[PDB]
Amino acid sequence: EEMLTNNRIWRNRTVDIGVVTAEDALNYGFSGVMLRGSGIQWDLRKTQPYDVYDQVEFDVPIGSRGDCYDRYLCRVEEMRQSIRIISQCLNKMPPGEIKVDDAKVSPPKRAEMKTSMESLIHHFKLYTEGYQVPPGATYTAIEAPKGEFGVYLVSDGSSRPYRCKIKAPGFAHLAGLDKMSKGHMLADVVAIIGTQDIVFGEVDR
Amino acid sequence: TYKYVNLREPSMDMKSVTDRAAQTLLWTELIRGLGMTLSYLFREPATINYPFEKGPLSPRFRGEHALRRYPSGEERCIACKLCEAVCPAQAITIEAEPRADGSRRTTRYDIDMTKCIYCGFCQEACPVDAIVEGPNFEFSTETHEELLYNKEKLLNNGDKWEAEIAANIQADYLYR
Amino acid sequence: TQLITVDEKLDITTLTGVPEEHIKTRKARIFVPARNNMQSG
Amino acid sequence: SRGEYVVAKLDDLINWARRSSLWPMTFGLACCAVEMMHMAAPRYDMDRFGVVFRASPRQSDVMIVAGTLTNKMAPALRKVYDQMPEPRYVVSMGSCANGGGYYHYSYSVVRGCDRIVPVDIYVPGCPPTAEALLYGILQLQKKIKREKRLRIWYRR
Amino acid sequence: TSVKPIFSRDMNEAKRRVRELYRAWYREVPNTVHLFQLDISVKQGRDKVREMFKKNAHVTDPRVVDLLVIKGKMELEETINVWKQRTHVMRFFHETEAPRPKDFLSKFYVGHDP
Amino acid sequence: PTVKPPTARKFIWTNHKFNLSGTPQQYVPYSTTRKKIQEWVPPSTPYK
Amino acid sequence: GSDRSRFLEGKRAVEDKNIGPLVKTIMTRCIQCTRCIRFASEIAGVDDLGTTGRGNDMQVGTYIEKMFMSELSGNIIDICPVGALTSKPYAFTARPWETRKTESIDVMDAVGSNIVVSTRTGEVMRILPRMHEDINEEWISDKTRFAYDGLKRQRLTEPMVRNEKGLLTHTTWEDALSRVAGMLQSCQGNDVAAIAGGLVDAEALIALKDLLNRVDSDTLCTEEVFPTAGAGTDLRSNYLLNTTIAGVEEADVVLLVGTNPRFEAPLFNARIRKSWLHNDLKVALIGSPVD
Amino acid sequence: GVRTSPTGEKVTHTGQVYDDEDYRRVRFVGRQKEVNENFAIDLIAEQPVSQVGSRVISCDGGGGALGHPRVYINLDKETKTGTCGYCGLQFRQQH
Amino acid sequence: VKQDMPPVGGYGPIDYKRNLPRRGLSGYSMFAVGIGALLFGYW
Amino acid sequence: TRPTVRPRNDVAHKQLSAFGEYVAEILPKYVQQVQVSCFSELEICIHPDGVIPVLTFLRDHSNAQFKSLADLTAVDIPTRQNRFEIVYNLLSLRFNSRIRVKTYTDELTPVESSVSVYKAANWYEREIWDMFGVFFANHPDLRRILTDYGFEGHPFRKDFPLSGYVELRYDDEVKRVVAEPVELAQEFRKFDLNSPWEAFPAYRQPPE
Amino acid sequence: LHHAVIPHGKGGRSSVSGIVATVFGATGFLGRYLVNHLGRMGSQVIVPYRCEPYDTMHLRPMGDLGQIIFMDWNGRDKDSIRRAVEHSNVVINLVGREWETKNFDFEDVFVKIPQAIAQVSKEAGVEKFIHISHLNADIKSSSKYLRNKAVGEKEVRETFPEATIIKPADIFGREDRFLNYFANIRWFGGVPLISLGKKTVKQPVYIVDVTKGIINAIKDPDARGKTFAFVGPNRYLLFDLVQYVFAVAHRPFLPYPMPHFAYRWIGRLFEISPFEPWTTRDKVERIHTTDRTLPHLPGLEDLGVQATPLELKAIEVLRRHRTYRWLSSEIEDVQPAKTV
Amino acid sequence: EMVRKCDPHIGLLHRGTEKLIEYKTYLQALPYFDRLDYVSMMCNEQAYSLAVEKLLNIQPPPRAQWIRVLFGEITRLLNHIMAVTTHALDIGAMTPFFWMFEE
Ligand SMILES: CCCCCCCCCCCCCCCCCC(=O)OC[C@H](COP(=O)([O-])OCC[N+](C)(C)C)OC(=O)CCCCCCCCCCCCCCCCC
Ligand SMILES: NC(=O)C1=CN([C@@H]2O[C@H](COP(=O)(O)OP(=O)(O)OC[C@H]3O[C@@H](n4cnc5c(N)ncnc54)[C@H](OP(=O)(O)O)[C@@H]3O)[C@@H](O)[C@H]2O)C=CC1
Ligand SMILES: C=C(C)[C@H]1Cc2c(ccc3c2O[C@@H]2COc4cc(OC)c(OC)cc4[C@@H]2C3=O)O1
Ligand code: SF4
Ligand code: SF4
Ligand code: SF4
Ligand code: SF4
Ligand code: SF4
Ligand SMILES: [K+]
Ligand SMILES: [Zn+2]
Secondary structure, three states, rough: OOOOOOOOHHHHHOOOOOOOOOOOOOOEEEOOOHHHOOOOOOHHHHHHHOOOOOOOOOOOOOOOOOHHHHHHHHHHHHHHHHHHHHHHHHOOOOOOOOOOOOOOOOOOOOOOOOOHHHEEEHHHHHHHHOOOOOOOOEEEEEEEEOOOEEEEEEOOOOOOEEEEEEHHHHHHHHHHHHHHHOEHHHHHHHHHHHHOOOOOOHHHH | OEEEOOOOOOOOHHHHHHHHHHHHHHHHHHHHHHHHHHHHHHHOOOOOOOOOOOOOOOOOOOOOOEEOOOOOOOOOOOOOOOOHHHHOOOOEEEEEEEEOOOOOOEEEEEEOOOOOOOOHHHHHHOOOOOOEOOOOOOEEEEEEHHHOOOOHHHHHHHHHHHHHHHHHHHOOOOOO | OEEEEEEOOOOOOOOOOOOOOOOOOOOOOOOOOOOOOOOOO | HHHHHHHHHHHHHHHHHOOOOOOOOEEEOOOOOHHHHHHHOOOHHHHHHHOOOOOOOHHOOEEEOOOOOOOOOOHHHHHHHOOOOOOOEEEOOHHHHHHOHHHHHOOOEOOOOOOOOOOEEHHHHHHHHOHHHHHHHHHHHHHHHHHOOOHHHHHO | OOOOOOOOOOOOHHHHHHHHHHHHHHHHHHHHHOOOOOOHHHHHHHHHHHHHHHHHOOOHHHHHHHHHHHHHHHHHHHOOOOOHHHHHHHHHOOOOOOOOOOOOHHHHHOOOOO | OOOOOOOOOOOOOOOOOOOOOOOOOOOOOOOOOOOOEEEEEOOOOOOO | OOOOOOOOOOOOOOOOOOOOOOOOOOOOOOOOOOOHHHHHHOOOOOOOOOEEOOOOOOOOOEEOOOOOOOOOOOOHHHHOOOOOEEEEEOOOOOHHHHOOEEEEEOOOOOOOOEEEEEOOOOOEEEEOOOOOOOOOOOOOOHHHHHHOOOOOEEEEEOOOOOOOOOOOOOOHHHHHHHHHHHHHHHOOOOOOOOOOOOOOOOHHHHHHHHHHHHOOOOOOOOOOOOOOOOOOOOHHHHHOOOOOOHHHOOOOOOEOOOOOOOOOOOHHHHHHHHHHHOOEEEEEOOOOOOO | OEOOOOOOEHHHHHOOOOOOOOOOHHHHHHOOOOOOOOHHHHHOOOOOEEOOOEEEEEOOOOOOOOOOOOEEEOOOOOOOEEEEOOOEEEEEOOO | OOOOOOOOOOOOOOOOOOOOOOOOOOHHHHHHHHHHHHHHHHH | OOOOOOOOOOOHHHHHHHHHHHHHHHHHOOOOEEEEEEEEOEEEEHHHHHHHHHHHHHHHOOOOOHHHHHHHHEEOOOOOOOHHHHHHHHEOOOOOEEEEEEEEEEEOEEEEEOOEEEEOOOOOOOHHHOOOOOEEEEEOOOOOOOOOOOOOOOOOOOOOOOOOOEEEEEOOOOOOOHHHHHHOOOOOOOOOOOOOOOOHHHOOOOOO | OOOOOOOOOOOOOOOEOOOOOOEEEOOOHHHHHHHHHOOOOOOEEEEEEEEOOOOHHHHHHOOOOEEEEEEEOOOOEEEEEEHHHHHOOEEEEEOOOOOOOOOOHHHHHHHHHHHHHHHHHOOOOOEEEEEEEOOOOOOOOOOOHHHHHHHHHHHHHHHHHHHHHEOOOEEEOOOOOOHHHHOOOOOOOOOOOOHHHHOEEOOEEEEEHHHHHHHHHHOOHHOOOOOEEEEOOEEEEEEHHHHHHHOOOOOOOOOEOOOOOOOHHHHHHHOOOOOOOOOOOOHHHHHHHOOOOOOOOOOOOOOOOOOOOOOHHHHHHOOOOHHHEEEEEOOOOOOOOEEE | OOOOOOOOOOOOOOOOHHHHHHHHHHHHHHHHOOOOOOOOHHHHHHHHHHHHHHHHHHOOOHHHHHHHHHHHHHHHHHHHHHHHHHHHHHHHHHHHHHHHOOO
């Protein structure tokens, strides 16, 4: 933050660069930082809480103008809040087991596989066949640090998924690139490719 | 539960306005950046002297594969093919037959190291700890077929690295 | 109207991109998969 | 002989000058680009060996194929390799560039980058560690050191 | 059997779009041979476009040839703009394959393929 | 291993060989099984 | 069932038995369900498997060193739901999830047994039955089950012609077919003939019939002599099993003339025995007093 | 117990060696056929038959959770040793 | 048991805040140094 | 039922049942089924001529406000006659919920493009042309987005096999990367892992 | 016939073709394209390489896993020749130098090494040996190249009687020494020719046709002991051939006759080099040697190979040697040459 | 050099993840999610884990959930270090790249 936030060369490359309005950010399927740079108050760890994000305390950085610089400050403050959550989880770590103790779902421990019979059958059948999943379609979405990472997983009832659609943030962000680079030069399109954190493994699948 | 990044209305008295004008003309934050760079000039950099030093690892590390043996010479692979039923790359080719003393052993245990994803489902699915994914990561080659490990090369990795793999499993088998 | 009347054979052999080599020289087999006698299910 | 001794010393000289100043090019494709960056990180640090990036193919000695070679970027990799001046080398990094890896049976992956370009060093991993990638670059240096250019030139 | 059309009501507009697509290819092929600097002539490229249009010339369904016009216009859209490369254009010209033996006795000799 | 040495076995190499690739001591793969279909050996006497 | 063990004890160990070179027997893995004994008592009809002992020591076996060899002795590999009776030739070679189950037909006998040839990486691993209610209900014989390794030995793989000294030398297909057709074109009328063997399908039989009718030869023979006198092979009624194999379920008197159906059509004898056991089939044999 | 085939090539523990006319020996021209010379059957033939004073013996390969799963072996035949299925060890009742 | 656990009194507090320490002179003092440099150079 | 069983949310279950009743009686022209899944996610199963009228409701109506098109999905199911099933996933920030608008088509029948409703679909249904072959009429720039340029066929169709019909290799005769008929090093070993005992009695279908 | 050498597959890259070919000198012009056209069938090809290993690296993308075995050899050593050919069922000779060096003359490349390889191929059980002579290789010719090549051809025919000896006339490709040679005399001057280059007649043949002929000679057992003659379908004079090359390359063409006695004195001016020399009097005596016509010998049409003429592939050869001002001129934008 | 139209052609790294998922088991379908967002590895692991656990009607233990949150926030540090430092690399501050990659 000392090297880049106060620096005039960084602000001259990020203040006017790639401004995203609010309703167009909701419209193009932007998620996470691309919404939170545009002032949209949306974080999937606070709105639709999963595993124990209801039992940690952290803040959600909200942008002001939607440029590269406000999304930069959103990412820096999310590193701040990540240090906050890591301090809490290093203080609030409970004792217990690490797999679910339902042995038809998770494999058994090795000392209880090399002694017992049912756990040997379950180790054998979980690593050869696997567990059967009930038939049905789900859409499970998390807040990956880019945005909404989602899996639309349709299962037929067997041990192999029938369909696994992967909603990735960088796909919709690189879609919104076509609006975001209107009226800039070559030297700002590289900053727009930056501020949308485009990792092309999730864009291309 | 939320905060506004970049919502600082600046001070507009003559003091802070003169301070920001001197900050613009006399380049204050540029000297701040130069000071931070010069402060990392005068440290000991974290460059380790490879290959006379090595990177830190842990006994869970997943590198070059190996087939282990009991402490009596007999090999551990009892040819039960879980490690090819769980191998996500399908990088393992197993064929077996009953040998001379009638024990269920392999005759083909191929691991294609250029298919293998080095995730260690084989070393955790093996019910006798036969296949292990050892600590060797410095096993790079110059020809593609040199990375198509058959049973002989995996037994040679096991016999070569057993003094290390047995100690790693001895240090790690209480967490699994 | 906004609806067309097609009385032709339903033919997507030129849209699926599958070559002719594996359309006319393959014998597809439609079958109830027979039960494995090792098991009773 | 004497001329054989001169060309042996010149082979040692020019092979030293070609191995102690390898210039890889910024060519990442997939997850191995992260570990190739970590091989350029402060800890493992390719540049202590004399090994620095140059982004153009015209001014690079080796091309580390870090990541998956799909069926849509086969001609881009081939033309990028072909625009490299001789001598050019290829370090195939990771399992997808070596032999298809985890996407070997898939419809849109070139099953190994040795189909498209000649490969001099195979670095196995998914990803191979930046220390192991550095070991692959050092094995490339041990391959360049035992080149015999002017010896075979004098003996033809 | 009462379904929704895509563009054409029956085979008249379908043959119209097939015919306009072939007009577009016949206009385009010299630009393709020029800017891809291929070693083929314009005559061999137009023979190949003729072969690609007579490969699918047995369709009687208007929706199927509507989608074939759509896919041909996508091929045209990616050929006019330089989005394809020399390899993508030359993949129609099967230069590197061994010539597949057609008669029965050679197919008997070289393998089990019917 | 001079304070806590690893446990010695009757088969562990006391001669650690390095990465032998490129040298004549290197590794060459091959199929480890045997011939599947045993072909017919014709007789050594004529049919007359 | 559940997913862990409360059995904090030491398990039993049962002695293995020796009942032939077909069924590898490890009686530790048995659960004493007695499909062995009801199979060998009702369908195989041997009455030489049983339960010895009493309590948790009840060993299912033969009680002596007796080699259980029936005509259907392999099907105790099928119906045993545990691994106490596995196939001894198939033993250790394969594993069922990777086997490709090609549904095929037995040719060892004229019963016409629906089977599954299950393969792996381009090699036949084992042969199992299919459930077909009128032929091979869900059984096969031991010849059908265990004649898969003779299928992969002694195979004619290349065309072989006579060299200058009368030895069989390997050659191409062009030379072998040319040297056959050179003598084929020099034959006309009854100068060329054919002998149809044992395992030959109707496609090949009608192929060779059309080829020897282009030469105009009707000398096309089979190994198994059927008498052509009277109607001969013209009407289909006098060379079939005209009722059905299923019709033995309906019958009450089955006369067997000059045959031994235990070894020739073994599952047809299994159908005669199931009609004998259940539908009270009255059987008479004219011939040698076989078992 | 490695031996040499009449083509000059070492035999594996499976029984794999290329014959005289097989061209696939050419991949070993100038290089070496990497085989293991510590055969499993030879190193387990050396191990003694363990005399135990129980009818049913429990084998686990040694090490507890570091070996094979613990199986129970019957030892009634005095003709035949009770061979463990996984580890190749074999037992005998001493009376 | 013997498991990876945090210590009984917890850990120390971890700072996570912005600390840009506000170093440097004032504006008027920097212009005073600059104008004094110009006047000494001119003399 | 405490430790290893996922706890049930009857509140979102009841609220999505009530909102499904609401949507099914607002739109009787296209909404064909409404189902609340057992883990409290609503599925509004509509007719393919109702892509524009339904999704404009959910984007605009003051009781729905499904502002963001999160995910768009086709699921090829070959045992139907309308084998493709376009799945819309909608996120509503104000009411903080998700809805699933599922509809159907076969190959030849087009689906009306929803870029007039959600601009986010500008690529997503484009992917459905590239992967499945569902044509979307009245789309701005519809073409392939993911596969190779000279790629024939649609990949995620289940009649299309795992490995395709073309492989690539560099060829030094013609100095060109060429596409040839595929010959694998190893065949893809298919595993028949379906255990023939009935796994779930609550998902048994009635017989013929 | 062994089971592993039985052909399988569709004849693609990962098929099995049943050819085990040792291609001597597979690093040069014909060897590059021959390993290309063998590796697309699935042949266990042995490449014996003399040179730097790096110069053979472009032979690695030409086949499947392990189908190409690279191994060292020396020309004056029958040990490595026996080590390389003893597992091959076909040996192909592509050893040649268009100039003489210090360590090897024309004789050691065309008489000693081909007879050495043919004798060792006889005494190792090889089914087919193939030697590649030149169409003008005669005992009574003016260049030492052609005389040594005819002597070595007669030796190979008298030491391996079933050797297929193939006569290419003048092969042109992307890496040739025929059309690139004719396009590299805009550097020296105005492409000088003996007797205006009008008294010599040529017919060049394209390398894909020669490679298809060599492989169809490997496949067909009708090639045992034969002597093929691969020629182009159209004959050319030298003068309008060079003028056609300079019109396809779109260059200023101003020819001038350099006499028969003073052009070998320029031929000695370039062969004083320890490098690869630019030209020599042997290349002069071979360009100014007309292609003989051998009707009693078979050609490409006696192997089921349709010969490709020059006007289809000269553009493919000569698009490199153009400037930018006519870099993308089409194939039809040039006048065809005058056949004789 | 002003920008009029941007058309991003993608699919140069398309490998067919979500067709290979259909032919492998769930435990085998997990390591694709390491390789989608390869700077957010355990995040995608957690997302697929929550998907399968939502279908299975089972929940993790408490310690597993707190370990998931701990390494998810370490993963959040990883992805934002990658984002910020390579965005400063693409703009030109190539130095905090090297300063933060020791972390
Ligand atoms: C030769 C010896 C060494 C020389 C010095 C070496 C060390 C210093 C170099 C530091 C690193 C610089 C790296 C590159 C930086 C690039 C950015 C940059 O330079 O931006 C320029 C910046 C640009 O500022 P800006 O772009 O932020 O401006 C704000 C503009 N708006 C509001 C529209 C956004 O500053 C200047 O242009 C300053 C020019 C020189 C100032 C000279 C002041 C003279 C004062 C005289 C007295 C005034 C008092 C009143 C009158 C009294 C009369 C007596
Ligand atoms: N224009 C043409 O190309 C024509 C050629 N031919 C004939 O075809 C054959 C091959 O020609 P071409 O490919 O063009 O020639 P090249 O120069 O391209 O290749 C010849 C090969 O022979 C090897 N070689 C030559 N001399 C020696 C030696 N003393 N020791 C070891 N290796 C040696 C070279 O090895 P290295 O790489 O180490 O130098 C090289 O690989 C020759 O017999 C030639 O006469 C016939 C008609 C036309
Ligand atoms: C120059 C140094 C010291 C580093 C930075 C760097 C490399 C090598 C290669 C690349 C690179 O950075 C650029 C930009 O950032 C990513 C990020 C990527 O993924 C997050 C990615 O994936 C393919 C590729 C890239 C580029 C890439 O190829 O070495
Ligand atoms: S570590 Fe490699 S061999 Fe083992 S299961 Fe994973 S991919 Fe397969
Ligand atoms: S390595 Fe282990 S899991 Fe694989 S077959 Fe051998 S004993 Fe079984
Ligand atoms: S070899 Fe594997 S881990 Fe490496 S870049 Fe490829 S997909 Fe990613
Ligand atoms: S059929 Fe199997 S389980 Fe049943 S009694 Fe026989 S051996 Fe035991
Ligand atoms: S697979 Fe079945 S029979 Fe075999 S040991 Fe396990 S439970 Fe017993
Ligand atoms: K059984
Ligand atoms: Zn044991």
